[PDB]
């Protein structure tokens, strides 16, 4: 039985839905850990040695631990599952990694993983094909009605404002503008000042924080802007199993529900 190592929880869960136990799916950066300076352990090096295929996000998500994907099993490829996604920068240059926060992109993650699994394990091609379509449809069925509702928001109110720049791909997929306090979790006073200024200028009503960062900056910004704190979104990791976002589909569904419930 082949072993497919995903870099972090979101990719692991996508892969499990496509492979359904035809392969063993493992995860390096488990739910509740963050990729930036994640410390690869000895046990983790075992996962790496066992992998027949390594599935990474790219867009620099793994940059701090790519060096551990070395001395690999012969034949084992590293696949970037965001291939085909036009990157969105962190400036007016380095890429923002959060490409999974998008309905269009979910379909691209699935397709690239389907393709890689099929190349690895061609005897099960018909199964990966069916599974990939089923899962793509399940995501569409859950998430499209939330998009449809979001799209009714009056143009002046088409802003996604968060703490980390975690929704920039969602904004591009749905046709919203994004404002945030820092591009990636690991914090700048000028970026806070800008968001405050932009919220006042555009009468922006809500700002969110996220499940792996502090709510204090968002709350402070809300106070300074006479905006409201929108609460916590799940974006960078799956939740614990009894939390609200234990799968990728549940993560998209929770965060988009919370956004649409806010913005109406």
Instruction: Give the integer Cα–Cα distance in Å for 172 and 261.
Output: 20
User: What does residue 141 show for φ and ψ, rounded to 5 degrees?
Assistant: -65, -35
Task: Tell whether residue 60 is among the known ligand binding residues.
Answer: no
- 236 in contact with Mn ion (CB under 5 A): yes
Give yes or no for residue 62 binding Mn ion (CB under 5 A): no
**Closer CB to Mn ion, 166 or 199, in the complex:** 166
- Nearer residue to Mn ion within complex by CB, 120 or 167: 167
Site for Mn ion in 7-26 (CB under 5 A): none
Least distance to Mn ion, CB of residue 169, Å: 12
The answer to whether 36 is annotated as binding is: yes
Distance CA 211, CA 114 (A): 29
Q: Is 172 in the site for Mn ion (CB under 5 A)?
A: no
Between 105 and 185, CB nearer to Mn ion: 185
Q: Following CA atoms 121, 98, 242, 136 in sequence, which dihedral angle do they give, to the nearest 10 degrees? A: -50
What CA–CA distance (Å, rounded) separates 255 from 7? Answer: 22
Distance of closest approach, residue 185 Cβ to Mn ion, in angstroms:
5
Nearest approach in angstroms of CB 236 to Mn ion is 4
Q: Closest Cα to residue 163, out of 87, 83, 218?
A: 218
- Does 210 interact with Mn ion (rule: CB under 5 A)? no
Nearest 5 degrees, angle CA 130-CA 134-CA 139?
150
Rounded Cα–Cα distance for residues 39 and 46 (Å)? 14
Q: Give the residue ranges of the annotated binding site for Zn(2+).
A: 36, 98, 164, 236
Binding positions for Mn ion, rule: CB under 5 A: 185, 236
Q: Give the residue ranges of the annotated binding site.
A: 36, 98, 164, 236
Q: Give the residue ranges of the annotated binding site for Mn(2+).
A: 36, 98, 164, 236
């Amino acid at each position: 039985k082949k072993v497919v190592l995903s870099s972090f929880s979101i990719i692991g869960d996508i892969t499990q839905n496509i492979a359904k136990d035809l392969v063993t799916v493992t995860t390096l950066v488990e739910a509740g850990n963050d990729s930036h300076s994640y410390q690869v352990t000895s046990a983790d090096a075992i996962k790496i040695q066992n992998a027949d295929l390594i599935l990474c996000n790219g867009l620099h998500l793994e940059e701090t631990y790519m060096k551990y994907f070395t001395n690999l099993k012969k034949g084992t490829k590293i696949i970037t599952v965001t291939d085909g996604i036009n990157p969105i920068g962190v400036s007016e240059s380095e890429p923002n990694p959060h490409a999974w926060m998008s309905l269009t992109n979910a379909m691209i993650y699935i397709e690239n993983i389907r393709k890689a699994l099929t190349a690895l394990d061609p005897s099960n091609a018909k199964k990966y094909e069916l599974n990939a379509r089923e899962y793509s449809e399940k995501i569409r069925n859950s998430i499209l009605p939330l998009k449809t509702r979001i799209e009714k928001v009056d143009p002046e109110k088409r802003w996604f404002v968060t703490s980390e720049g975690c929704l920039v791909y969602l904004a591009e997929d749905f046709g919203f503008k994004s404002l945030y306090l820092w591009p990636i979790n690991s914090r700048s006073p000028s970026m806070m000042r800008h968001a405050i200024n932009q919220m006042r200028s555009h009468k922006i009503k809500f700002i969110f924080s996220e499940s792996t960062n502090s709510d204090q900056p968002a709350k402070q910004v809300a106070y300074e802007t006479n905006a409201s704190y929108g609460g916590v979104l799940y974006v960078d990791s799956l939740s614990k199993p009894d939390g609200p976002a234990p799968t990728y589909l549940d993560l998209l569904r929770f965060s988009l529900t919370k956004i649409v419930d806010t913005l109406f």
